Scaffold this motif. Structure first.
Motif, PDB file in Angstrom:
ATOM      1  N   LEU A 139       0.841  -1.153   0.000  1.00  0.00           N
ATOM      2  CA  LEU A 139       0.000   0.000   0.000  1.00  0.00           C
ATOM      3  C   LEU A 139       0.920   1.261   0.000  1.00  0.00           C
ATOM      4  CD1 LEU A 139      -2.714  -1.141   2.641  1.00  0.00           C
ATOM      5  CD2 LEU A 139      -3.056  -0.704   0.180  1.00  0.00           C
ATOM      6  N   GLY A 140       2.073   1.239   0.664  1.00  0.00           N
ATOM      7  CA  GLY A 140       2.988   2.415   0.509  1.00  0.00           C
ATOM      8  C   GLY A 140       4.256   2.122   1.281  1.00  0.00           C
TER       9      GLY A 140
ATOM     10  N   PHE B 297       8.121   5.874   7.228  1.00  0.00           N
ATOM     11  CA  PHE B 297       7.375   4.800   8.013  1.00  0.00           C
ATOM     12  C   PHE B 297       7.659   3.301   7.780  1.00  0.00           C
ATOM     13  CE2 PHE B 297       5.216   6.417   4.371  1.00  0.00           C
ATOM     14  CZ  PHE B 297       4.755   5.274   3.703  1.00  0.00           C
TER      15      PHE B 297
ATOM     16  N   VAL C 244       4.205  -0.779   4.118  1.00  0.00           N
ATOM     17  CA  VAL C 244       2.912  -1.239   4.588  1.00  0.00           C
ATOM     18  C   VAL C 244       2.168  -1.945   3.496  1.00  0.00           C
ATOM     19  CG1 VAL C 244       0.808  -0.606   5.876  1.00  0.00           C
ATOM     20  CG2 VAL C 244       2.681   0.988   5.721  1.00  0.00           C
TER      21      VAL C 244
ATOM     22  N   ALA D  22      -3.958  -4.260   7.633  1.00  0.00           N
ATOM     23  CA  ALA D  22      -2.794  -3.674   6.935  1.00  0.00           C
ATOM     24  C   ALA D  22      -1.617  -4.239   7.719  1.00  0.00           C
ATOM     25  CB  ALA D  22      -2.785  -2.109   7.015  1.00  0.00           C
TER      26      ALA D  22
ATOM     27  N   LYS E 163       2.281  -3.589   8.685  1.00  0.00           N
ATOM     28  CA  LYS E 163       3.285  -2.523   8.606  1.00  0.00           C
ATOM     29  C   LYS E 163       4.618  -2.992   9.134  1.00  0.00           C
ATOM     30  CE  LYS E 163       4.200   2.196  10.306  1.00  0.00           C
ATOM     31  NZ  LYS E 163       3.481   3.377  10.954  1.00  0.00           N
TER      32      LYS E 163
ATOM     33  N   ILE F  83      -6.899   4.547  14.331  1.00  0.00           N
ATOM     34  CA  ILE F  83      -6.652   3.200  13.832  1.00  0.00           C
ATOM     35  C   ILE F  83      -6.401   2.240  15.000  1.00  0.00           C
ATOM     36  CG2 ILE F  83      -4.152   3.408  13.573  1.00  0.00           C
ATOM     37  CD1 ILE F  83      -6.489   2.011  10.806  1.00  0.00           C
TER      38      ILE F  83
ATOM     39  N   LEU G 215      -2.589  -3.887  11.634  1.00  0.00           N
ATOM     40  CA  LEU G 215      -3.547  -2.798  11.890  1.00  0.00           C
ATOM     41  C   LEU G 215      -4.881  -3.139  11.212  1.00  0.00           C
ATOM     42  CD1 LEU G 215      -0.669  -0.437  11.147  1.00  0.00           C
ATOM     43  CD2 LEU G 215      -1.944  -0.368  13.329  1.00  0.00           C
ATOM     44  N   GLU G 216      -5.945  -2.596  11.751  1.00  0.00           N
ATOM     45  CA  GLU G 216      -7.252  -2.721  11.058  1.00  0.00           C
ATOM     46  C   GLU G 216      -7.229  -2.058   9.701  1.00  0.00           C
ATOM     47  OE1 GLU G 216      -9.240   0.769  13.293  1.00  0.00           O
ATOM     48  OE2 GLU G 216     -10.964  -0.306  12.498  1.00  0.00           O
TER      49      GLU G 216
ATOM     50  N   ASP H 170      -7.082   7.097   1.115  1.00  0.00           N
ATOM     51  CA  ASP H 170      -6.321   7.989   1.947  1.00  0.00           C
ATOM     52  C   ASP H 170      -6.743   9.423   1.596  1.00  0.00           C
ATOM     53  OD1 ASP H 170      -3.349   7.869   3.464  1.00  0.00           O
ATOM     54  OD2 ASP H 170      -3.706   9.610   2.118  1.00  0.00           O
TER      55      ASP H 170
ATOM     56  N   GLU I  13      -2.136  12.856   4.426  1.00  0.00           N
ATOM     57  CA  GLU I  13      -1.579  11.498   4.142  1.00  0.00           C
ATOM     58  C   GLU I  13      -1.884  10.517   5.281  1.00  0.00           C
ATOM     59  OE1 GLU I  13       2.501  13.544   2.925  1.00  0.00           O
ATOM     60  OE2 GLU I  13       2.484  11.460   2.158  1.00  0.00           O
ATOM     61  N   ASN I  14      -2.082  11.055   6.494  1.00  0.00           N
ATOM     62  CA  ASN I  14      -2.280  10.172   7.632  1.00  0.00           C
ATOM     63  C   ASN I  14      -3.707  10.108   8.082  1.00  0.00           C
ATOM     64  OD1 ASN I  14       0.355   9.328   7.753  1.00  0.00           O
ATOM     65  ND2 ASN I  14       1.052  10.950   9.175  1.00  0.00           N
TER      66      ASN I  14
ATOM     67  N   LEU J  29      -7.346   8.241   6.864  1.00  0.00           N
ATOM     68  CA  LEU J  29      -8.018   7.347   5.880  1.00  0.00           C
ATOM     69  C   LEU J  29      -9.512   7.709   5.918  1.00  0.00           C
ATOM     70  CD1 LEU J  29      -6.683   3.836   6.796  1.00  0.00           C
ATOM     71  CD2 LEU J  29      -5.883   5.532   5.037  1.00  0.00           C
TER      72      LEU J  29
ATOM     73  N   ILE K  15      -4.145   7.690  11.280  1.00  0.00           N
ATOM     74  CA  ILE K  15      -3.203   6.542  11.233  1.00  0.00           C
ATOM     75  C   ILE K  15      -1.730   7.046  11.420  1.00  0.00           C
ATOM     76  CG2 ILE K  15      -4.650   5.156   9.627  1.00  0.00           C
ATOM     77  CD1 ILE K  15      -2.705   6.070   7.340  1.00  0.00           C
ATOM     78  N   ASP K  16      -0.774   6.091  11.412  1.00  0.00           N
ATOM     79  CA  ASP K  16       0.635   6.409  11.514  1.00  0.00           C
ATOM     80  C   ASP K  16       1.090   7.184  12.724  1.00  0.00           C
ATOM     81  OD1 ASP K  16       3.284   7.443   9.224  1.00  0.00           O
ATOM     82  OD2 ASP K  16       3.307   6.315  11.157  1.00  0.00           O
TER      83      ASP K  16
HETATM   84  N1  LIG Z   1       2.535   6.886   6.336  1.00  0.00           N
HETATM   85  C1  LIG Z   1       1.782   6.520   5.118  1.00  0.00           C
HETATM   86  C2  LIG Z   1       2.228   5.156   4.484  1.00  0.00           C
HETATM   87  C3  LIG Z   1       1.402   4.765   3.223  1.00  0.00           C
HETATM   88  C4  LIG Z   1      -0.073   4.798   3.674  1.00  0.00           C
HETATM   89  N2  LIG Z   1      -0.953   4.618   2.523  1.00  0.00           N
HETATM   90  C5  LIG Z   1      -2.037   3.899   2.598  1.00  0.00           C
HETATM   91  C6  LIG Z   1      -2.822   3.780   1.447  1.00  0.00           C
HETATM   92  N3  LIG Z   1      -3.980   2.991   1.645  1.00  0.00           N
HETATM   93  C7  LIG Z   1      -4.266   2.393   2.841  1.00  0.00           C
HETATM   94  C8  LIG Z   1      -3.451   2.561   3.969  1.00  0.00           C
HETATM   95  C9  LIG Z   1      -3.713   1.959   5.251  1.00  0.00           C
HETATM   96  C10 LIG Z   1      -4.776   1.090   5.481  1.00  0.00           C
HETATM   97  C11 LIG Z   1      -5.062   0.575   6.772  1.00  0.00           C
HETATM   98  C12 LIG Z   1      -4.285   0.918   7.888  1.00  0.00           C
HETATM   99  C13 LIG Z   1      -3.213   1.834   7.672  1.00  0.00           C
HETATM  100  C14 LIG Z   1      -2.427   2.248   8.836  1.00  0.00           C
HETATM  101  C15 LIG Z   1      -1.094   2.703   8.756  1.00  0.00           C
HETATM  102  S1  LIG Z   1      -0.060   2.970   7.424  1.00  0.00           S
HETATM  103  C16 LIG Z   1       1.217   3.589   8.522  1.00  0.00           C
HETATM  104  O1  LIG Z   1       2.293   3.975   8.090  1.00  0.00           O
HETATM  105  N4  LIG Z   1       0.825   3.656   9.813  1.00  0.00           N
HETATM  106  C17 LIG Z   1      -0.438   3.161   9.910  1.00  0.00           C
HETATM  107  O2  LIG Z   1      -0.971   3.145  11.039  1.00  0.00           O
HETATM  108  C18 LIG Z   1      -2.934   2.332   6.407  1.00  0.00           C
HETATM  109  N5  LIG Z   1      -2.341   3.325   3.793  1.00  0.00           N
HETATM  110  C19 LIG Z   1      -0.399   6.205   4.210  1.00  0.00           C
HETATM  111  C20 LIG Z   1       0.411   6.296   5.516  1.00  0.00           C
END
Ligand SMILES: N[C@H]1CC[C@H](Nc2cncc(-c3cccc(/C=C4\SC(=O)NC4=O)c3)n2)CC1
Length: 271
Positions: free
Chosen positions: A10-11, A15, A18, A31, A33, A70, A86-87, A94, A137-138, A140, A151-152
């Motif tokens: 996913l990215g 971080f 993930v 997810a 990570k 999250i 993570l859920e 995003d 970005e953080n 969802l 998130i993150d």
């Molecule tokens: N720091 C960017 C890393 C790329 C990410 N991009 C995406 C794109 N689609 C879905 C998700 C996703 C889905 C479910 C859960 C999470 C949770 C995360 S990701 C993370 O670094 N820390 C978390 O708690 C993330 N992330 C945007 C956080």
């Protein structure tokens, strides 16, 4: 391990990496990570001595008693990394991607999203956690239910009332006292970042790209934005930290009145 099937990446970044995954036992979307040990600056420990990334301590603190943050379901240690489960809402997008695609958000939609981000940050703070990287970005968006998730937590810290002198979140969301002095207090730096985020939602991009622009704190609107919404943004981006609103003052602002519920928001705006 054999508990999870891995799907697409996913990215990746600061971080670590993930991936989308599914928990094999009940098909739950997750997810997965991967956090490299070399890149973890802060370590914490569990109420039984086990040494963990601080991100895991922080996620456990906020695990309890909402849905706008999250949820950590499990974690594993490996020789060079930790693996956090993570859920994962599905369908999800995003918020950074959503604003890439839709441009500036209509104020009614930005107000519902912003309100939900304020509820999620108030929940972190009530649990003794400072996120330190609030940005689009953080966040969802659960597209069916109109619910946002912060998130993150990998840049976060325990919340405290004295000054912080380290920072590793996103510089273009960080406040002028961090740029100038390398010092900030947690809540007023969080409110500045919420000012950047609200300008990002209603204008479709962040106001400041350069240090010199952050320290000047002068805000120009390139899109039509109501005077009540500009007033709130400019309050959150006050140069003096003590001139910024508290969370209660933001949520009592005139611009924040009559918020849509998340489901109505999805029905009206997310189809
Ligand atoms: N720091 C960017 C890393 C790329 C990410 N991009 C995406 C794109 N689609 C879905 C998700 C996703 C889905 C479910 C859960 C999470 C949770 C995360 S990701 C993370 O670094 N820390 C978390 O708690 C993330 N992330 C945007 C956080």
């Amino acid at each position: 391990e054999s508990q999870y099937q891995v799907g697409p990446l996913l990215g990746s970044g600061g971080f670590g990496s993930v991936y989308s995954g599914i928990r094999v036992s009940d098909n739950l979307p997750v997810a997965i990570k991967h956090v490299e040990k070399d890149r973890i600056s802060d370590w914490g420990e569990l109420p039984n001595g086990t040494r963990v990334p601080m991100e895991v301590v922080l996620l456990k603190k906020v695990s309890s008693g909402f849905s706008g943050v999250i949820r950590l379901l499990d974690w594993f240690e490996r020789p060079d990394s930790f693996v956090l489960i993570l859920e994962r809402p599905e369908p999800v997008q995003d918020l950074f991607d959503f604003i890439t695609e839709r441009g500036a958000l209509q104020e009614e939609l930005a107000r519902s999203f912003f309100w939900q981000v304020l509820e999620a940050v108030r929940h972190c703070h009530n649990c003794g956690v400072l996120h330190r990287d609030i940005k689009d970005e953080n966040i969802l968006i659960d597209l069916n239910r109109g619910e946002l998730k912060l998130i993150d937590f990998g840049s976060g810290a325990l919340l405290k009332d004295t000054v912080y002198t380290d920072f590793d979140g996103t510089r273009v969301y960080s406040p002028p006292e961090w740029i100038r002095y390398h010092r900030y207090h947690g809540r007023s730096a969080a409110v500045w970042s919420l000012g950047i985020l609200l300008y990002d939602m209603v204008c479709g991009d962040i106001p400041f790209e350069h240090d010199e622009e952050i320290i000047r704190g002068q805000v120009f609107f390139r899109q039509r934005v109501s005077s009540e919404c500009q007033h709130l943004i400019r309050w959150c981006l006050a140069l003096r930290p003590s001139d910024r609103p508290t969370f209660e003052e933001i949520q009592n602002h005139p611009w924040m009145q009559d918020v849509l519920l998340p489901q109505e928001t999805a029905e009206i705006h997310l189809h």
